């Protein structure tokens, strides 16, 4: 037959465990999109183990969400990327944020895959959370301060 999601990996059995059986990218979209909550916290992280228990209770940030859930489906096998970017709201303003470009299997490539669309702002899969304004900022999670 043809190629399918691999479900074997360490971070997906966790977050089946949590929040119910899912197939893909889509699927998982769609249990996280009835499963978990947004909660804001800065720009503090947490381990990935912390956010799969406080994802469903508590809540997690885009920040947790993106490390969390890029690891998941880069061993379903999907090609991933974490994109920080800016986003206006229709109240006027911008906002910093992190979500998720994903491509492969049922998925097209550059995909938008946004926790906070899914949780907080009930926008679609491929929809980032806010659609007033876009602006690529880089790829990654920026990294800690040094100095001294």
Known sequence: ???????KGHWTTKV?????????????????????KYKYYYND?????VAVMRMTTSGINCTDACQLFSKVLEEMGYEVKIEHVRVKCNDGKW?????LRVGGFELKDGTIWDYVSATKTGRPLGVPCCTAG???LGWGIVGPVYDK
């Open 1 to 7: 037959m043809q190629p399918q999601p691999s479900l």
């Open 16 to 36: 089946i465990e949590k929040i119910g059986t899912f197939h893909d990218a889509t699927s998982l979209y769609e249990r996280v999109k009835k499963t978990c």
């Open 45 to 49: 992280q947490v381990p990935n183990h």
């Open 95 to 99: 906002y910093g944020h992190y979500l």
């Open 134 to 136: 876009f602006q690529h």
